[model samples]
Target: MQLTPFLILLRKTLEQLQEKDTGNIFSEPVPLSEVPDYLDHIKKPMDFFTMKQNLEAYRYLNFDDFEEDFNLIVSNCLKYNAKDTIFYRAAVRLREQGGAVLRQARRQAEKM
Candidate 1:
């Protein structure tokens, strides 16, 4: 549950990737390390299909209680008030997505 946000971020980062394998990333064994020669042995790739397409297929390969995992991560950033750590900056980033989206969400939340 605690890993959903990180997993999501990783997935988003690799969303547009065009790896050589052409296999489902969720079902495939993700290589944690990059291999220059093999090229697709890394996260980012040359090109890819639509993010929507990739994400849809990707989620289908997962069996996690996604709601629970996502909620735990969401609960995390909401009350995770620490700044004197290496992950502080990343935490802030993880608390939100695009700048405009984050701003809009903040505005809506404040009004509510």
Candidate 2:
């Protein structure tokens, strides 16, 4: 399958998200020990680490799948933390900027 372009798009989007993680908040999974109620609130936790692993595992067959995981990470944050908190704001920022990153990557993919 000629999926190199799609792979590039997915990888680029992940990299861009990591780059934007100034606080390193989204870089790893939320420690379950510290946040005891996290699992209670967030049924499915997603993070950059898992994203990379999934990317490596060929778990995402298309951009929709990739975007789904991306949204999950952001949504999980918003669900677990208060809107006024930095974690929530970071998720909001990622959700807002993530679209732009994906769009920019799509433009690049077209040129490939």
Candidate 3:
């Protein structure tokens, strides 16, 4: 599809979230006209590299809070995503990825 400015921003924001696992969005979220006043929800960044390297590593992060932000992002995508199948597919992928991240973390917790 054509890369409308809004679509570009929206997709970039999703990529930033999904690729970096960064704790913050790059710009104001959609469906909310004004700047975002959402939670920081991070004590420290939680990129993939930042995750524990070993069972003995200290990974002090609150994933529940991250999930809140993650959900909001995907939820916003669901609300504002274009009807284009590719656009909506990205949203679906994001939602599923968020859940996978949570589930893997939970499984790791169980192993501990």
Candidate 4:
């Protein structure tokens, strides 16, 4: 489970998405060629800090559109059956975090 490469690629994708949303700086769509292998040599899920950082990156870039982009990211990661386990685990974690974030967002929205 070598995850460094996957983390690196994910970080890069988040950065690109951020740039696109903020300064309208667009990059070519991330091709399947760029996705990292989740089964190479690593164990354990990614740390919470890294997950939080990526989530923040998405929010900072897309703001209210964070959920949509996050889902897209997860979907892209699940495009291959060989990679299903890794992506599925990630999706479950994302859903858990996203639920918390959505609750907060809803609370904030209600105040408006």
Candidate 5:
């Protein structure tokens, strides 16, 4: 029962992140053809779509594991793009908002 509630909560958080994304940049995987060096720079690529897929696939054994991927999405953008760039700015915003989202979920999960 607790696990079911947690999964539902996780999905809600993921949707919030996807909805908050400004340019739909973090919504999908980074296209290798568009950025050839992206793979060279980012070791573990993470995105909202992939996270959703993983969730549905029962890939995450723990909530912390899901949070790791969430942080990775922001970190990968920050690493790949310059500070002055839009992508970097989005990552910064996401870091802040995403933290809040996670905190909210954490509190909710505690209640469950």
Candidate 6:
């Protein structure tokens, strides 16, 4: 629930993702259903239990099918090659920021 813990998780996830050999055109994208929950959790003073539940629900979700979906999103959203380290870094940054925000939200919820 703490910012540190969330950041640690985010960094760990990113590191794991980066370590995998996804080749030039493929890297695991975050699950679509989970994305909204992740964003919502990070942006609102929601319950930590709910956050955990949402994450657990998505635990087995894979992005292989969504790579093409993500590619489409990426193509429309920005100009970058699939193999670019910068793009991966950006993805990691976004997730890290979301995790941090979720931590903040959890703290706020605890106070109320």
Q: Pick the candidate with the highest lDDT.
A: 5
TM-score-based ranking, best first? 5, 2, 3, 4, 6, 1
Residue range 1-112, candidate 4, lDDT tens digits = 2334434444554444333233221123333255465334322223223444655554333334444555554454344324457545554555555555555554544444
Per residue, candidate 5 scores C-alpha lDDT tens digits across 38-88 of 998799999999999999888875678889999999999999999999999
What global local distance difference test value does model 5 have? 0.88
- Judge candidate 4 against the unseen true structure and give its global Cα lDDT, from 0 to 1: 0.43
TM-score of each: 0.23, 0.88, 0.42, 0.37, 0.93, 0.24
Across 1-112, the per-residue lDDT of candidate 2 in tens digits comes to: 3576678677878999888878889888899999888998787898999999999898987667777888899999999889899999999988887878877866765666
Off by over 4 Å in 6: 1-85
- Count clashes in each candidate, considering only residues at least 3 apart in sequence or on different chains: 0, 0, 0, 4, 0, 0
Q: Please state every model's RMSD to the true fold in angstroms.
A: 13.6, 1.9, 14.0, 14.4, 1.2, 15.2
Distance (Å) between predicted and true CA of 95, model 4? 1.6
Cα error, residue 81 of model 1, in Å, equals 7.5
| TM-score attained by model 2 | 0.88
> Which 10-residue span in candidate 2 carries the lowest summed lDDT?
1-10
Candidate 1: where are CA atoms >4 Å away? 1-67, 74-81, 98-112
Write the residue-wise lDDT of candidate 6 on 50-101 in tens digits: 3334345553133232122322333422333244566555544444543554
lDDT (Cα atoms) of all candidates against the true structure: 0.35, 0.84, 0.43, 0.43, 0.88, 0.38
Candidate 3 per-residue lDDT, tens place, 5-90, comes to 42333333334455633333323333233424322332222222222221124222334433455565555555544657554566
Position 13, candidate 5: lDDT: 86
Error of 5 at 59 (Å): 1.4
Greater-TM-score candidate between 5 and 6: 5
Please estimate how well model 1 matches the true structure, expressed as its whole-model Cα lDDT.
Answer: 0.35
Compute the lDDT of residue 24 as modeled in candidate 5: 90
What stretches of model 5 exceed 4 Å from their correct place? none
